[PDB]
Structure 1
């Protein structure tokens, strides 16, 4: 099997990049693809750049050229769920665009015409995420709705808008819905396994830069554990 792993920033992909054996690097359209193996499992790690367009473009190139069997989105996120602390893992049940609005034509808030209102994480991948979490007993996680937009959320007004429209939101970021929508269009299973760098408030610019490395560490540990589980999930393969 081949696992596609996608992160936006260099800092988000660095830990996993260093684990790829027999690594081959391709640079294309602002994207970097690292292909090789982890523990005999074929992996392609994409560093896409930030935001919905970069993530969509990168994901489209990843799927069309490398044909991963599954996609895992790694990286940081801004926490909305009360129970999340900085460094904690967040897992997508589903992903929505918080900044999509075609309600004028009867679509629900966040729904892009032509798409479902939410992009559901693959149930079989989800089971692997749960298994990985069970093997990291020091790790606290929350699973729920992840909301994506092309904005860094750092104001009370920004938070309130998102909570008003998506009351179940557990975290926000800037790529997941683009990765998930792209995967939906290609019919490829995905899950988002990120970790919290900040709580999307006026302190988040500073918190983000301070704790991005921690978030990358936590997210990356989970993703590595999933790769190790996938290695011997022969029914899944």
Structure 2
């Protein structure tokens, strides 16, 4: 297992990356979160510009990494982290636009399951429709933590799309189906976690209504 490190996308040696990785798309947010919350910060990756740091938050060892944009981008990083680097738990953190009209800006969405456009599923030769879900233990602790620090949260279904810019109007059906917010990464993360028998959770803060450090604290309490 350690034999396949480093990877073509990650310059770190085995053991260099903690058992709990927090991930965001932005390397600037990853670089910030590390500087803001972690002592003894050590950079393990810079390959592909995708920074990764290991450090300490309230005693527990913890790593952060950027994942770039889209299911195939996160797909690569997650696969390596789980299958090559002995990662047990990934929590993704990022921004989202809301489909649920009752959501206010700055609300925390917890991705219990993820709808998606086609990405990885065809690689698994699955003879039906596969539902992407987060790890329940992780999901539960985020809800507990969210309700402890008194933050407005919503827990349920999200949609990992392939587009940022819709050509037509497609948000209709998802909205009717009760999908909460749109992003572009979660479903691949869930699929990869499932296949690895590992823990994964996606958490989102609402940045655009389609009708920020507060989220980080919830995430951090999960390490």
Flag whether TM exceeds 0.5 (same fold): yes
- Whether contact under 8 Å (1:8, 1:175) holds in the other structure is no
- Whether contact under 8 Å (1:94, 1:121) holds in the other structure is yes
Distance 1:188 1:117 in 2: 17
Alignment map for 1:166-205 (pairs within 5 Å): 167-200=177-210
Q: Which runs of 5 or more residues in structure 2 are unaligned? A: 1-17
Deviation, 1:200, is 3.6
Distance 1:96 1:111 in 2: 13
1:54 aligns with 2:73: yes
Larger helix fraction of residues: 1
- Tell me the TM-score normalised to structure 2 length: 0.79
Find the partner of 1:134 among 137, 147, 170: 147
Distance 1:157 1:121 in 2: 28
Coordinate RMSD, CA, aligned: 2.4
Deviation, 1:134, is 2.0
Deviation, 1:224, is 2.4
Flag as ranges the 4+ runs of structure 1 deviating above 6 A.
none
1:151 aligns with 2:169: no
1:218 aligns with 2:202: no
Deviation, 1:144, is 0.7
- Whether contact under 8 Å (2:90, 2:201) holds in the other structure is yes
- Whether contact under 8 Å (1:44, 1:68) holds in the other structure is no
- Whether contact under 8 Å (2:27, 2:51) holds in the other structure is no
- The aligned residue for residue 40 of structure 2 is 22
1:43 aligns with 2:62: yes
Q: Which runs of 5 or more residues in structure 1 are unaligned? A: 101-109, 202-215, 228-237
Give the number of aligned pairs. 200
1:120 aligns with 2:127: no
